[PDB]
Design a protein around this nucleic acid. Structure first.
Lengths: 57, 60
DNA sequence: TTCTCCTATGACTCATCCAT
DNA sequence: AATGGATGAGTCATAGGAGA
């Protein structure tokens, strides 16, 4: 028993370490994308403001 | 044979555990950063927009 | 191409740290 | 003091890759 219960832990402990790794990999992926796109919209906007600041100046 | 390999494999078990600790430490720390970068672009965007409008009004 | 050897990695077990 | 889970670390079996 003592061994059998403990197996179950070691097993569960390995899995947690595995998942966190997965989850992170996933988060890194989506972040790269959203993070990259908002950058593009950020640029469409920076220039438009630059332009308008002039038209008003 | 064993005395050789056992210590030899001891190093591998160690080195592998080593990498997983670092892989995670890195991904974790990287996503923390990417999260911030994203977060700030969301505010950079919000402010750019307010400027955009403001200027369009000046051209009203 | 298939056969051989070696490292990397899962899964077990053990010792140890903390809380009940 | 006693019992139970978490996690590091050693061991084994075994797979997958580099090379004869």
């Amino acid at each position: 028993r003592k061994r059998m219960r403990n197996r179950i832990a070691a097993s569960k402990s390995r899995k947690r370490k595995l998942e966190r790794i997965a989850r992170l990999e996933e988060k890194v992926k989506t972040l790269k994308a959203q993070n990259s796109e908002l950058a593009s919209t950020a640029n469409m906007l920076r220039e438009q403001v630059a332009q308008l600041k002039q038209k008003v100046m | 044979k064993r005395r050789i390999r056992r210590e030899r494999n001891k190093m591998a078990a160690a080195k592998s555990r080593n990498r997983r600790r670092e892989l995670t430490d890195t991904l974790q720390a990287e996503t923390d950063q990417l999260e911030d970068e994203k977060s700030a672009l969301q505010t950079e965007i919000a402010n750019l927009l307010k400027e955009k409008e403001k200027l369009e009004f000046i051209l009203a």
